[PDB]
A = this chain, B = another copy of it.
Amino acid sequence: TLPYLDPAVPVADRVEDLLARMTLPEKVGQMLQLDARDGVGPAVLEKHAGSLLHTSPENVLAAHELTGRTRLRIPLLLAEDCIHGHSFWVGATIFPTQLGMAATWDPALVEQVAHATAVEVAATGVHWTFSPVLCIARDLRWGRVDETFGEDPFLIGELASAMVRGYQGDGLSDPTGILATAKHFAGYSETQGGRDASEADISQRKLRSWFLPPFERVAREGCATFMLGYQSMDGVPVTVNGWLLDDVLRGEWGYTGTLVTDWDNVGRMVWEQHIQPDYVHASAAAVRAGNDMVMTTPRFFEGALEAVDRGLVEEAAIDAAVRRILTLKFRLGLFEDPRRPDVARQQAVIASAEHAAVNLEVARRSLVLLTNDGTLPFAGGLDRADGRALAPAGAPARTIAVVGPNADDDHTQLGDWAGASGQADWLPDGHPREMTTTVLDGFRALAPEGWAVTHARGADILTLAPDPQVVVPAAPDDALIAEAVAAARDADLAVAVVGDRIELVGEGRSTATLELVGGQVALLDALVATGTPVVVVVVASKPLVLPPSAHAAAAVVWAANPGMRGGQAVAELVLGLIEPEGRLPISFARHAGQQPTYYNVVRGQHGVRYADLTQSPAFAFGEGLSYTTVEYADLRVLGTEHGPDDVVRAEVTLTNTGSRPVRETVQVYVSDTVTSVTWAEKELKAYRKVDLAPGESATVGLEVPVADCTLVDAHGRRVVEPGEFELRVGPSSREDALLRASFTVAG
């Protein structure tokens, strides 16, 4: 032989030969992506599904057998949330979350993470990951901040670009490449209240200004699929948003990839957004809008068939979507090799030493040292003879008390979209306890022979009660507090590991207050009051408001969810076996009502502060300490006048005036002095990592293409306007940390 089965026949002819043989239910079936947890049998055989997601290892094997019993034997696309590692394969390598990864400011490293993930994913027979996430974290109340690369469009684009390259490899014939997904297109991350898929009050120009740029980048770089957002934007759900899908994605960007909806997008237009009277009309709307894959709306099957039968849409529209789906399957070679799981390759590559080394590198470089009174590195810093550290000169016996609810919690350390986080039902125990080094594990393994490591839980966070169940913050626990206070009073250092956990994170779980829940604030107050130096380690999904006692503690480390090696990286940082390198990809609010606290705030406000609160963030985008001092000086623009096709070139001089080496992340912001429409005060446009030995000075070149110095004007065009600009260069987005030099652009 049949021509669609002949690999010598051109793809377009194979597609036409198969399409002409399909019944309409078989064609509608190809548009369906169904939840395999509900039973692969009916999905493959009765609904003729084109794709499955959340397919357990036993159901992947069953799905291939079922395909063999179908009339046309069209291979399935098996898709999965493989979000920061192969989230739902027991024993896979689980990396930090994207938010954690973004603190490395290292696209080359993030590409290694994505490539390592795809290698593991491919060995399990999954073809397609719903990753990377390109949402921009502009309201910290949102439950899914942990899934973003932070608050900056340029850095998001850098790191999402790296993920797509790493996942897709050499292309559709690469055996270790998988399809990437640009999600969640677009505007999902900034909706009313920071709630999950509440209304997006985002105009066309606002979306173009702060949300689209990373999506346009990965579209142009060949991201195989896009996922359409759950949310209504200016009253129109993305699933039927013609401006966004046709004018922007297909038209302005010329995108030729394949679309998939988010979970039950089509159905939600009936029962949650209340914009369609029934499933037939919602199905017709989704077809008319140009959707391809419809994720987990089972009733699209009968709804689209009735819509065609009633003349609401043409069978030709179904054909157009199936043509695109079949083209993808043919180009992946799935009719010749359906890419079944391979046990021998799973044993060779899943959680390989290779992959664990990448994971350790990301964990080590993601930790952000936010405050330090000199207590760190502890006892002046330690040396090794990998392996246990030696007691340093002048500190033969020390005791480190490791306390707090997140100090020994391996599930919470890995975060959402991993293990037992809840979206997959075949990982009851999550990932093997084996594979995660908690903070307590890390200190127990690295503290010198001669030092002691003690543990006390100190505080609980929450319990669940009936109304899904609702969170009940843990009560005061004087006995639990007093046990941790006793450990600290008998210690030289108290390492308090605090944060959030899964019931306070993710879909349907935005938070209003951003505060530590349960007994954690009381624990931190009591610990600091002992006079033993306290290091607060925040293991949490997103930036939290920390209590006054955390700001009075000796040091504060931000770890996001640092993955399987995170606990080793934490102990190494505290003990000085590594230098800190992480830099914040996101700003920390002092109060939920303080927002916006992202750095790229649009100008115009009457005043600089709330009457009851500063507008200065607790910690700002790009901030983060090392164990040395670095002086920035002598920022110069080399030729200040520019035409549109030129490059802004600059130099700055850095000096390591301290005693330890550093990898410094130089950050380059552009400010547009006079804008035709109101605009951000500044935006990150470039950055550079610079290694500096103690006492070393270096003059490093910097550049920003003039073409990147854009704004979105009143006509919705992203343009460089002639006029004055400032280049702002320094170690963070804090204005008092930035050198500045003027430049101009002329027509």
**What are the residues of chain B within 8 A of A470 when measuring CB–CB?**
609
Q: Which A-B residue pairs are the 6 nearest by beta carbons?
A: A592-B593, A235-B677, A508-B607, A512-B593, A512-B613, A203-B203
**What are the residues of chain B within 8 A of A593 when measuring CB–CB?**
141, 194, 511-514, 591-593
Does A234 interact with chain B (Cβ within 8 Å)?
Answer: yes
Does A612 interact with chain B (Cβ within 8 Å)?
Answer: yes
The stretch of A78-86, A168-176, A273-281, A419-427 that contacts the partner chain: A273-281
> Closest approach, in angstroms, between the C-beta of A644 and any C-beta of chain B?
19
A195–B605 CB distance below 8 A: yes
Task: Give 19 new A-B contacts, CB below 8 A, not counting A141-B610, A277-B723, A512-B594.
Answer: A193-B596, A193-B615, A196-B605, A198-B602, A199-B678, A201-B203, A202-B203, A203-B234, A232-B602, A235-B714, A272-B604, A275-B675, A277-B674, A471-B612, A504-B611, A510-B607, A511-B611, A512-B613, A591-B592
> Closest approach, in angstroms, between the C-beta of A89 and any C-beta of chain B?
27
Type the 1/0 row for A383-413, where 1 means its CB is closer than 8 Å to any CB of B: 0000000000000000000000000000000
Are A511 and B613 also in contact (CB < 8 A) when A193-B595, A206-B234 are? yes
Does A315 interact with chain B (Cβ within 8 Å)?
Answer: no
Task: Pick the contact of A607: B195, B237, B513 (CB < 8 A).
Answer: B195
> Closest approach, in angstroms, between the C-beta of A536 and any C-beta of chain B?
20
> Closest approach, in angstroms, between the C-beta of A717 and any C-beta of chain B?
12
**What are the residues of chain B within 8 A of A602 when measuring CB–CB?**
192, 198-199, 232
**What are the residues of chain B within 8 A of A198 when measuring CB–CB?**
602, 604-605
Nearest B-chain residue to A612, judged by Cβ = B511
Which chain A residues (489-521) contact chain B, with CB distance < 8 Å?
503-505, 507-515, 517
Which chain A residues (452-510) contact chain B, with CB distance < 8 Å?
470-471, 473, 503-505, 507-510
Does A310 interact with chain B (Cβ within 8 Å)?
Answer: no
Does A528 interact with chain B (Cβ within 8 Å)?
Answer: no
CA distance in complex: A193, B595 (Å): 6
Nearest B-chain residue to A595, judged by Cβ = B193
Nearest B-chain residue to A505, judged by Cβ = B611
Taking residues whose C-beta sits less than 8 angstroms from the other chain, chain A's interface range is: 35 or more
Task: Pick the contact of A678: B194, B203, B273, B607 (CB < 8 A).
Answer: B273
Which chain A residues (595-626) contact chain B, with CB distance < 8 Å?
595-596, 601-607, 609-613, 615
Are A611 and B510 also in contact (CB < 8 A) when A197-B606, A595-B193, A603-B272 are? yes
CA distance in complex: A677, B309 (Å): 26
> Closest approach, in angstroms, between the C-beta of A197 and any C-beta of chain B?
4
**What are the residues of chain B within 8 A of A473 when measuring CB–CB?**
612
Which chain A residues (235-288) contact chain B, with CB distance < 8 Å?
235-237, 268, 272-277
Nearest B-chain residue to A723, judged by Cβ = B277
B678–A611 CB distance below 8 A: no
Nearest B-chain residue to A602, judged by Cβ = B199
Does A330 interact with chain B (Cβ within 8 Å)?
Answer: no
CA distance in complex: A676, B232 (Å): 12
Nearest B-chain residue to A712, judged by Cβ = B235
**What are the residues of chain B within 8 A of A274 when measuring CB–CB?**
603, 673-675, 678-679
CA distance in complex: A747, B723 (Å): 56
B235–A510 CB distance below 8 A: no
Does A298 interact with chain B (Cβ within 8 Å)?
Answer: no
Nearest B-chain residue to A674, judged by Cβ = B277
**What are the residues of chain B within 8 A of A131 when measuring CB–CB?**
none
> Closest approach, in angstroms, between the C-beta of A692 and any C-beta of chain B?
36
A606–B517 CB distance below 8 A: no
CA distance in complex: A609, B503 (Å): 12
Nearest B-chain residue to A508, judged by Cβ = B607
B509–A611 CB distance below 8 A: yes
Nearest B-chain residue to A270, judged by Cβ = B674
A678–B603 CB distance below 8 A: no
Does A381 interact with chain B (Cβ within 8 Å)?
Answer: no
**What are the residues of chain B within 8 A of A512 when measuring CB–CB?**
591, 593-594, 610, 612-613
**What are the residues of chain B within 8 A of A713 when measuring CB–CB?**
235
Nearest B-chain residue to A206, judged by Cβ = B201
Does A230 interact with chain B (Cβ within 8 Å)?
Answer: yes
B199–A201 CB distance below 8 A: no
CA distance in complex: A194, B593 (Å): 9
Task: Pick the contact of A517: B234, B275, B594, B612 (CB < 8 A).
Answer: B612
Does A143 interact with chain B (Cβ within 8 Å)?
Answer: yes
A235–B612 CB distance below 8 A: no
